[PDB]
Coordinates of N, CA and C and ligand atoms in Angstrom, one line a residue:
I1 N 107.2 -3.9 130.2 CA 107.0 -5.0 131.2 C 107.8 -6.2 130.9
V2 N 108.7 -6.6 131.7 CA 109.5 -7.9 131.5 C 108.8 -9.0 132.3
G3 N 108.6 -10.1 131.7 CA 108.1 -11.3 132.4 C 106.7 -11.2 132.8
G4 N 105.9 -10.3 132.1 CA 104.5 -10.2 132.3 C 103.7 -11.0 131.4
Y5 N 102.4 -10.6 131.2 CA 101.5 -11.3 130.3 C 100.6 -10.3 129.6
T6 N 100.0 -10.7 128.5 CA 99.2 -9.8 127.7 C 97.9 -9.6 128.5
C7 N 97.6 -8.3 128.8 CA 96.5 -8.0 129.7 C 95.2 -8.5 129.1
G8 N 95.0 -8.2 127.8 CA 93.7 -8.3 127.2 C 93.2 -6.9 126.9
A9 N 92.6 -6.8 125.7 CA 92.2 -5.5 125.2 C 91.2 -4.8 126.2
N10 N 91.6 -3.6 126.6 CA 90.7 -2.7 127.4 C 90.4 -3.3 128.8
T11 N 91.2 -4.2 129.3 CA 91.0 -4.8 130.6 C 91.6 -3.9 131.7
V12 N 92.4 -2.9 131.3 CA 93.0 -1.9 132.2 C 92.5 -0.6 131.8
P13 N 91.2 -0.2 132.1 CA 90.6 0.9 131.4 C 91.1 2.3 131.8
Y14 N 91.8 2.4 132.9 CA 92.4 3.6 133.4 C 93.8 3.8 132.8
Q15 N 94.4 2.8 132.1 CA 95.7 3.0 131.5 C 95.7 3.9 130.3
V16 N 96.5 4.9 130.3 CA 96.6 5.8 129.1 C 98.0 5.7 128.5
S17 N 98.1 6.0 127.2 CA 99.4 6.2 126.5 C 99.6 7.6 126.3
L18 N 100.7 8.2 126.6 CA 101.1 9.6 126.3 C 101.9 9.5 125.0
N19 N 101.4 10.3 124.0 CA 101.9 10.2 122.7 C 102.4 11.6 122.2
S20 N 103.6 11.7 121.7 CA 104.2 12.9 121.1 C 104.7 12.6 119.7
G21 N 103.9 11.9 118.9 CA 104.3 11.3 117.7 C 104.5 9.9 117.7
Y22 N 104.5 9.3 118.9 CA 104.9 7.9 119.3 C 104.5 7.8 120.8
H23 N 104.3 6.6 121.2 CA 104.1 6.4 122.7 C 105.5 6.6 123.4
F24 N 105.4 7.4 124.5 CA 106.6 7.6 125.3 C 106.5 7.4 126.8
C25 N 105.3 7.3 127.3 CA 105.1 7.1 128.7 C 103.6 6.6 128.9
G26 N 103.4 5.9 130.0 CA 102.1 5.6 130.5 C 101.6 6.7 131.4
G27 N 100.3 6.5 131.8 CA 99.6 7.4 132.8 C 98.4 6.7 133.2
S28 N 97.7 7.4 134.1 CA 96.5 6.8 134.7 C 95.4 7.9 134.7
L29 N 94.2 7.5 134.2 CA 93.1 8.4 134.2 C 92.5 8.4 135.6
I30 N 92.4 9.6 136.2 CA 91.8 9.7 137.6 C 90.5 10.4 137.6
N31 N 90.1 11.2 136.6 CA 88.7 11.6 136.4 C 88.6 11.9 134.9
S32 N 87.4 12.5 134.5 CA 87.2 12.6 133.1 C 88.1 13.6 132.5
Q33 N 88.8 14.5 133.2 CA 89.6 15.5 132.7 C 91.1 15.4 133.1
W34 N 91.5 14.5 133.9 CA 92.8 14.5 134.5 C 93.5 13.2 134.5
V35 N 94.8 13.2 134.1 CA 95.7 12.0 134.1 C 96.8 12.3 135.1
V36 N 97.2 11.2 135.8 CA 98.4 11.3 136.6 C 99.5 10.4 136.0
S37 N 100.7 11.0 135.9 CA 101.9 10.3 135.3 C 103.1 10.7 136.2
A38 N 104.3 10.3 135.7 CA 105.6 10.6 136.3 C 106.0 12.0 135.9
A39 N 106.6 12.8 136.8 CA 107.3 14.0 136.4 C 108.4 13.8 135.4
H40 N 109.1 12.7 135.4 CA 110.1 12.5 134.4 C 109.6 12.3 133.0
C41 N 108.3 12.1 132.9 CA 107.6 12.0 131.6 C 107.2 13.4 131.0
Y42 N 107.5 14.5 131.7 CA 107.1 15.8 131.3 C 107.8 16.1 129.9
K43 N 107.0 16.7 129.0 CA 107.4 17.3 127.8 C 106.2 18.1 127.2
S44 N 106.5 18.9 126.2 CA 105.5 19.6 125.5 C 104.9 18.7 124.4
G45 N 103.7 19.1 123.9 CA 103.1 18.4 122.8 C 102.5 17.0 123.1
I46 N 101.9 16.9 124.2 CA 101.4 15.6 124.7 C 99.9 15.4 124.2
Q47 N 99.7 14.3 123.5 CA 98.3 13.8 123.2 C 98.1 12.6 124.1
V48 N 97.0 12.6 124.9 CA 96.6 11.5 125.7 C 95.8 10.6 124.9
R49 N 96.1 9.3 124.9 CA 95.4 8.3 124.2 C 94.8 7.3 125.2
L50 N 93.5 7.3 125.2 CA 92.7 6.5 126.1 C 92.1 5.4 125.3
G51 N 91.7 4.3 126.0 CA 91.1 3.2 125.3 C 91.9 2.4 124.4
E52 N 93.3 2.4 124.6 CA 94.2 1.7 123.8 C 94.4 0.3 124.2
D53 N 94.6 -0.6 123.2 CA 95.3 -1.8 123.4 C 96.5 -1.9 122.5
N54 N 96.3 -2.2 121.2 CA 97.4 -2.0 120.2 C 97.6 -0.6 119.9
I55 N 98.8 0.0 120.3 CA 99.1 1.4 120.1 C 99.4 1.8 118.7
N56 N 99.6 0.8 117.8 CA 99.9 1.0 116.4 C 98.7 0.8 115.5
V57 N 97.5 0.4 116.0 CA 96.4 0.1 115.2 C 95.1 0.8 115.8
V58 N 94.3 1.4 115.0 CA 93.1 2.0 115.5 C 92.1 0.8 115.6
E59 N 91.7 0.4 116.8 CA 90.9 -0.7 117.0 C 89.4 -0.4 117.3
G60 N 89.1 0.8 117.7 CA 87.7 1.3 117.8 C 87.3 1.7 119.1
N61 N 88.1 1.7 120.2 CA 87.7 2.1 121.5 C 88.5 3.3 122.0
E62 N 89.4 3.9 121.1 CA 90.3 4.9 121.5 C 89.6 6.3 121.6
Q63 N 90.1 7.1 122.5 CA 89.8 8.5 122.5 C 91.2 9.2 122.5
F64 N 91.4 10.1 121.6 CA 92.7 10.9 121.5 C 92.3 12.3 121.9
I65 N 93.0 12.8 123.0 CA 92.6 14.1 123.5 C 93.9 14.8 123.9
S66 N 94.2 16.0 123.3 CA 95.4 16.8 123.6 C 95.4 17.3 125.1
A67 N 96.6 17.4 125.6 CA 96.7 18.1 126.9 C 96.6 19.6 126.8
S68 N 95.9 20.2 127.8 CA 95.8 21.6 127.8 C 96.8 22.2 128.8
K69 N 97.2 21.5 129.8 CA 98.1 21.9 130.9 C 98.7 20.7 131.5
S70 N 100.0 20.9 131.8 CA 100.7 19.9 132.6 C 101.3 20.6 133.9
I71 N 101.2 19.9 135.0 CA 101.7 20.4 136.3 C 102.6 19.4 136.9
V72 N 103.9 19.6 136.8 CA 104.9 18.8 137.5 C 104.9 19.2 139.0
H73 N 105.1 18.2 139.8 CA 105.0 18.4 141.3 C 106.0 19.5 141.6
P74 N 105.6 20.5 142.5 CA 106.5 21.6 142.8 C 107.9 21.2 143.3
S75 N 108.0 20.0 144.0 CA 109.2 19.6 144.6 C 109.9 18.5 143.9
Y76 N 109.5 18.2 142.6 CA 110.2 17.2 141.8 C 111.7 17.5 141.7
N77 N 112.5 16.5 142.0 CA 114.0 16.6 141.7 C 114.4 15.6 140.7
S78 N 114.8 16.1 139.5 CA 115.1 15.2 138.4 C 116.4 14.4 138.6
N79 N 117.3 14.8 139.5 CA 118.5 14.0 139.8 C 118.2 12.8 140.7
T80 N 117.3 12.9 141.7 CA 117.0 11.9 142.6 C 115.7 11.2 142.3
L81 N 114.9 11.8 141.5 CA 113.5 11.4 141.2 C 112.6 11.4 142.4
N82 N 113.0 12.2 143.5 CA 112.1 12.4 144.5 C 110.9 13.2 144.0
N83 N 109.7 12.9 144.4 CA 108.4 13.5 144.0 C 108.2 13.4 142.5
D84 N 108.3 12.2 142.0 CA 108.2 11.9 140.6 C 106.7 11.7 140.2
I85 N 106.0 12.8 140.1 CA 104.6 12.8 139.8 C 104.2 14.1 139.1
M86 N 103.3 14.0 138.2 CA 102.8 15.1 137.4 C 101.3 14.9 137.0
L87 N 100.6 16.0 136.9 CA 99.2 15.9 136.5 C 99.1 16.5 135.1
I88 N 98.2 16.0 134.3 CA 98.0 16.4 132.9 C 96.5 16.6 132.8
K89 N 96.1 17.8 132.4 CA 94.6 18.1 132.2 C 94.3 18.0 130.7
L90 N 93.2 17.3 130.4 CA 92.8 17.1 129.0 C 92.0 18.3 128.5
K91 N 92.2 18.6 127.2 CA 91.5 19.8 126.6 C 89.9 19.6 126.7
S92 N 89.5 18.4 126.6 CA 88.0 18.0 126.7 C 87.9 16.8 127.6
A93 N 86.7 16.7 128.2 CA 86.5 15.5 129.1 C 86.4 14.2 128.3
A94 N 87.1 13.2 128.8 CA 86.9 11.9 128.2 C 85.5 11.4 128.4
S95 N 85.0 10.6 127.5 CA 83.7 9.9 127.6 C 84.0 8.6 128.4
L96 N 83.5 8.5 129.6 CA 83.8 7.4 130.4 C 82.8 6.2 130.1
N97 N 83.3 5.0 130.1 CA 82.6 3.8 129.7 C 83.3 2.6 130.3
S98 N 82.9 1.4 130.0 CA 83.6 0.2 130.6 C 85.0 0.1 130.2
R99 N 85.4 0.7 129.0 CA 86.8 0.5 128.5 C 87.6 1.8 128.7
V100 N 87.0 2.9 129.2 CA 87.8 4.1 129.5 C 87.2 4.5 130.8
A101 N 87.9 4.4 131.9 CA 87.4 4.5 133.2 C 88.5 5.0 134.1
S102 N 88.1 5.9 135.1 CA 89.0 6.4 136.1 C 89.4 5.4 137.1
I103 N 90.6 5.5 137.7 CA 91.0 4.7 138.8 C 91.0 5.5 140.1
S104 N 90.5 4.9 141.1 CA 90.3 5.6 142.4 C 91.7 5.9 143.0
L105 N 91.8 7.1 143.7 CA 92.9 7.4 144.4 C 92.9 6.7 145.8
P106 N 94.0 6.5 146.4 CA 94.0 5.8 147.7 C 93.5 6.7 148.8
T107 N 92.8 6.1 149.8 CA 92.5 6.7 151.0 C 93.5 6.4 152.1
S108 N 94.2 5.3 151.9 CA 95.2 4.8 152.8 C 96.4 4.3 152.0
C109 N 97.6 4.4 152.5 CA 98.7 3.8 151.8 C 98.6 2.2 151.9
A110 N 99.3 1.6 151.0 CA 99.3 0.1 150.9 C 100.5 -0.4 151.6
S111 N 100.4 -1.6 152.2 CA 101.4 -2.3 153.0 C 102.2 -3.3 152.1
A112 N 103.5 -3.4 152.5 CA 104.3 -4.5 151.9 C 103.5 -5.8 152.0
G113 N 103.6 -6.6 150.9 CA 102.9 -7.8 150.7 C 101.7 -7.7 149.9
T114 N 101.1 -6.5 149.8 CA 99.9 -6.3 148.9 C 100.2 -6.6 147.5
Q115 N 99.3 -7.4 146.8 CA 99.5 -7.7 145.4 C 99.0 -6.5 144.6
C116 N 99.7 -6.1 143.6 CA 99.3 -5.0 142.7 C 99.4 -5.4 141.2
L117 N 98.8 -4.6 140.4 CA 98.9 -4.8 138.9 C 99.6 -3.6 138.3
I118 N 100.7 -3.9 137.6 CA 101.5 -3.0 136.9 C 101.4 -3.2 135.4
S119 N 101.2 -2.1 134.7 CA 100.9 -2.3 133.2 C 101.6 -1.3 132.4
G120 N 101.8 -1.6 131.1 CA 102.4 -0.6 130.2 C 102.8 -1.3 128.9
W121 N 103.3 -0.4 128.0 CA 103.8 -0.7 126.7 C 105.3 -0.7 126.6
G122 N 106.0 -0.8 127.8 CA 107.5 -0.7 127.8 C 108.1 -2.0 127.3
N123 N 109.5 -1.9 127.2 CA 110.3 -3.0 126.8 C 110.0 -4.3 127.5
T124 N 109.9 -5.4 126.8 CA 109.7 -6.7 127.4 C 110.9 -7.5 127.6
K125 N 112.1 -7.0 127.3 CA 113.3 -7.8 127.5 C 114.2 -7.1 128.5
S126 N 114.9 -7.9 129.3 CA 115.8 -7.3 130.3 C 117.2 -7.2 129.8
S127 N 117.6 -8.0 128.8 CA 118.8 -7.8 128.0 C 118.3 -7.9 126.5
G128 N 118.6 -6.8 125.8 CA 118.0 -6.6 124.5 C 116.8 -5.7 124.6
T129 N 116.1 -5.5 123.4 CA 115.0 -4.6 123.4 C 114.0 -5.1 122.4
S130 N 112.7 -5.1 122.9 CA 111.6 -5.5 122.1 C 110.4 -4.7 122.7
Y131 N 109.7 -3.9 121.9 CA 108.6 -3.1 122.4 C 107.3 -3.7 121.9
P132 N 106.4 -3.9 122.8 CA 105.1 -4.6 122.3 C 104.2 -3.6 121.8
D133 N 103.2 -4.1 121.0 CA 102.1 -3.3 120.5 C 101.0 -3.2 121.5
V134 N 100.7 -4.4 122.1 CA 99.5 -4.5 123.0 C 100.0 -4.4 124.4
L135 N 99.0 -4.0 125.3 CA 99.3 -3.7 126.7 C 99.7 -4.9 127.4
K136 N 100.8 -4.8 128.2 CA 101.3 -5.9 129.1 C 101.0 -5.6 130.5
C137 N 100.9 -6.7 131.3 CA 100.5 -6.6 132.7 C 101.5 -7.5 133.5
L138 N 101.6 -7.1 134.8 CA 102.4 -7.9 135.7 C 101.8 -7.8 137.1
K139 N 101.5 -8.9 137.7 CA 101.1 -8.9 139.1 C 102.4 -9.0 140.0
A140 N 102.5 -8.1 141.0 CA 103.7 -8.0 141.8 C 103.4 -7.5 143.1
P141 N 104.1 -8.0 144.2 CA 103.8 -7.5 145.5 C 104.7 -6.3 145.9
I142 N 104.1 -5.4 146.7 CA 104.9 -4.4 147.3 C 105.9 -5.0 148.3
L143 N 107.1 -4.5 148.2 CA 108.2 -5.0 149.0 C 108.4 -4.1 150.3
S144 N 108.9 -4.7 151.3 CA 109.1 -4.0 152.6 C 110.1 -2.8 152.3
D145 N 109.9 -1.7 153.1 CA 110.7 -0.6 153.0 C 112.2 -1.0 153.3
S146 N 112.4 -1.9 154.2 CA 113.8 -2.3 154.5 C 114.4 -3.0 153.4
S147 N 113.7 -3.9 152.7 CA 114.3 -4.6 151.6 C 114.5 -3.6 150.4
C148 N 113.6 -2.6 150.2 CA 113.8 -1.6 149.2 C 115.1 -0.8 149.4
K149 N 115.2 -0.3 150.7 CA 116.4 0.5 151.0 C 117.7 -0.3 150.9
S150 N 117.6 -1.6 151.3 CA 118.8 -2.4 151.2 C 119.2 -2.7 149.7
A151 N 118.2 -2.8 148.8 CA 118.4 -3.0 147.4 C 119.1 -1.7 146.8
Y152 N 118.7 -0.5 147.3 CA 119.1 0.7 146.7 C 119.6 1.6 147.8
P153 N 120.8 1.3 148.4 CA 121.4 2.2 149.4 C 121.4 3.6 149.0
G154 N 121.0 4.5 149.9 CA 121.1 5.9 149.7 C 120.1 6.6 148.7
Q155 N 119.2 5.8 148.2 CA 118.3 6.3 147.1 C 116.8 6.3 147.4
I156 N 116.3 5.6 148.3 CA 114.9 5.4 148.5 C 114.4 6.5 149.5
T157 N 113.5 7.3 149.1 CA 112.9 8.3 150.0 C 111.6 7.9 150.5
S158 N 111.0 8.6 151.4 CA 109.7 8.3 151.9 C 108.6 8.5 150.8
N159 N 108.9 9.0 149.6 CA 108.0 9.1 148.5 C 108.1 8.0 147.5
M160 N 108.8 6.9 147.9 CA 109.1 5.8 147.0 C 108.8 4.5 147.6
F161 N 108.4 3.5 146.8 CA 108.4 2.1 147.3 C 108.8 1.2 146.2
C162 N 109.3 0.0 146.6 CA 109.7 -1.0 145.7 C 108.5 -2.0 145.6
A163 N 108.4 -2.6 144.4 CA 107.5 -3.7 144.1 C 108.1 -4.6 143.1
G164 N 107.8 -5.9 143.2 CA 108.4 -6.9 142.3 C 109.0 -8.1 143.0
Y165 N 110.1 -8.5 142.5 CA 110.7 -9.8 142.8 C 112.2 -9.7 142.9
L166 N 112.7 -9.9 144.1 CA 114.1 -9.8 144.3 C 114.9 -10.8 143.5
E167 N 114.3 -12.0 143.1 CA 115.0 -12.9 142.3 C 115.2 -12.5 140.8
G168 N 114.6 -11.4 140.4 CA 114.7 -10.9 139.0 C 113.7 -11.6 138.1
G169 N 113.7 -11.1 136.9 CA 112.9 -11.7 135.8 C 111.5 -11.1 135.6
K170 N 111.0 -10.3 136.5 CA 109.7 -9.7 136.4 C 109.7 -8.3 136.9
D171 N 109.4 -7.3 136.0 CA 109.6 -5.9 136.4 C 109.0 -5.0 135.3
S172 N 108.8 -3.7 135.7 CA 108.6 -2.7 134.7 C 109.9 -2.3 134.0
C173 N 109.8 -1.6 132.9 CA 111.0 -1.3 132.1 C 110.7 0.0 131.3
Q174 N 111.7 0.4 130.5 CA 111.7 1.6 129.7 C 110.4 1.6 128.9
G175 N 109.7 2.8 129.0 CA 108.4 2.9 128.3 C 107.2 2.6 129.1
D176 N 107.4 2.0 130.3 CA 106.3 1.8 131.2 C 106.2 3.0 132.2
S177 N 107.3 3.8 132.2 CA 107.4 5.1 133.0 C 106.0 5.8 133.0
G178 N 105.6 6.3 134.2 CA 104.5 7.0 134.3 C 103.2 6.3 134.5
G179 N 103.2 5.0 134.2 CA 102.0 4.1 134.3 C 101.7 3.7 135.7
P180 N 100.6 3.0 135.8 CA 99.9 2.6 137.1 C 100.5 1.4 137.8
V181 N 100.4 1.5 139.1 CA 100.5 0.4 140.0 C 99.2 0.4 140.8
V182 N 98.3 -0.6 140.6 CA 97.0 -0.6 141.2 C 96.9 -1.8 142.1
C183 N 96.4 -1.5 143.3 CA 96.4 -2.5 144.4 C 95.0 -2.4 145.0
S184 N 94.2 -3.5 145.0 CA 92.9 -3.5 145.5 C 92.0 -2.4 144.9
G185 N 92.2 -2.1 143.7 CA 91.4 -1.1 143.0 C 91.7 0.3 143.2
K186 N 92.9 0.6 143.8 CA 93.4 1.9 144.1 C 94.7 2.2 143.4
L187 N 95.0 3.4 143.0 CA 96.2 3.8 142.4 C 97.2 4.1 143.5
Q188 N 98.1 3.1 143.8 CA 99.1 3.3 144.8 C 100.5 3.7 144.3
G189 N 100.8 3.4 143.1 CA 102.1 3.7 142.6 C 102.1 4.2 141.1
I190 N 103.2 4.9 140.8 CA 103.5 5.3 139.4 C 104.9 4.8 139.1
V191 N 105.0 4.2 137.9 CA 106.3 3.6 137.4 C 107.3 4.7 137.4
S192 N 108.3 4.6 138.2 CA 109.3 5.7 138.3 C 110.7 5.3 137.8
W193 N 111.4 4.4 138.5 CA 112.8 4.1 138.1 C 113.2 2.8 138.6
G194 N 114.4 2.3 138.1 CA 115.0 1.1 138.6 C 116.4 1.1 138.0
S195 N 117.2 0.1 138.5 CA 118.5 -0.1 137.9 C 118.4 -1.2 136.9
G196 N 118.4 -0.8 135.6 CA 118.1 -1.8 134.6 C 116.6 -2.2 134.8
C197 N 116.3 -3.4 134.2 CA 115.0 -4.0 134.4 C 115.1 -5.5 134.7
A198 N 114.3 -5.9 135.7 CA 114.2 -7.3 136.0 C 115.5 -8.0 136.5
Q199 N 116.4 -7.1 137.0 CA 117.7 -7.6 137.5 C 117.6 -8.1 138.9
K200 N 118.3 -9.2 139.2 CA 118.3 -9.7 140.6 C 118.7 -8.6 141.6
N201 N 117.9 -8.6 142.7 CA 118.1 -7.6 143.8 C 117.9 -6.2 143.4
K202 N 117.3 -5.9 142.3 CA 117.0 -4.5 141.8 C 115.6 -4.4 141.3
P203 N 114.6 -4.4 142.3 CA 113.2 -4.3 141.9 C 112.9 -2.9 141.4
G204 N 111.7 -2.8 140.8 CA 111.2 -1.5 140.3 C 110.9 -0.6 141.5
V205 N 111.1 0.7 141.3 CA 110.8 1.7 142.3 C 109.7 2.6 141.7
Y206 N 108.8 2.9 142.6 CA 107.5 3.5 142.3 C 107.2 4.7 143.2
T207 N 106.6 5.7 142.6 CA 106.2 6.9 143.3 C 105.0 6.5 144.2
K208 N 105.1 6.9 145.5 CA 104.1 6.5 146.5 C 102.9 7.5 146.5
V209 N 101.9 7.1 145.7 CA 100.8 8.0 145.4 C 100.1 8.5 146.6
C210 N 99.9 7.6 147.6 CA 99.2 8.0 148.8 C 99.7 9.3 149.4
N211 N 101.0 9.6 149.3 CA 101.5 10.8 149.8 C 101.1 12.1 149.1
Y212 N 100.5 11.9 147.9 CA 100.2 13.1 147.0 C 98.7 13.3 146.8
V213 N 97.8 12.6 147.5 CA 96.4 12.7 147.3 C 95.9 14.1 147.6
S214 N 96.4 14.7 148.7 CA 95.9 16.1 149.0 C 96.4 17.1 147.9
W215 N 97.6 16.9 147.5 CA 98.1 17.8 146.4 C 97.3 17.6 145.1
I216 N 97.0 16.3 144.7 CA 96.2 16.1 143.5 C 94.9 16.7 143.6
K217 N 94.2 16.5 144.8 CA 92.8 17.0 144.9 C 92.8 18.5 144.9
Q218 N 93.7 19.1 145.6 CA 93.6 20.6 145.6 C 94.0 21.2 144.3
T219 N 95.0 20.6 143.6 CA 95.4 21.0 142.3 C 94.2 20.9 141.3
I220 N 93.5 19.8 141.3 CA 92.4 19.7 140.4 C 91.3 20.7 140.7
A221 N 91.1 20.9 142.0 CA 90.0 21.8 142.5 C 90.2 23.3 142.0
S222 N 91.4 23.7 141.7 CA 91.7 25.0 141.3 C 92.3 25.2 139.9
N223 N 92.2 24.1 139.1 CA 92.8 24.1 137.7 C 91.9 23.5 136.7
Ligands
CA301 CA1 94.9 1.5 119.2

């Protein structure tokens, strides 16, 4: 997160870190056994880390649970990032509490202008590189579809939305991939892609979760 603020420990209780020897992506806990992330975060050997603040220090609220199954969206295209969503099942159910809690799925899509909370452990610099230990947060509005498409000619599908600031300076970045965009207490986006980070006229692009609720629910119901 570039231009954000320190969330505060366990104030984003649905935020997970995906770990394969190191943090490599975010995700969102959606029930005691399932995490939603980006398809571009797919790899083998995932341990889901819940209850994290400092990802380098055991602080006492963590739960570390290995993934038993990953399901990349059937229509994910890794060249265009269309359908950039994946589900991860935990080998055992997380113990839910005030600091480890699921985020509700949307019942409706969110509109341009809605304020959302984007969070992660990604790079905090737009030029140069600095990776934080503690979770970073950014409040950002959903941008209109027309401004999103104008920012990224030929690249924005109906499964994507932009959020952020066209003036630059505030954005998600490398390592925030797969993490949550939460608006009015619902998971509306997944950190997907952008051109650089926090660049003028190049806001972050996010997977439009509301399009996937039926797939998520039916997948969970049979897996
Ligand atoms: Ca920790």
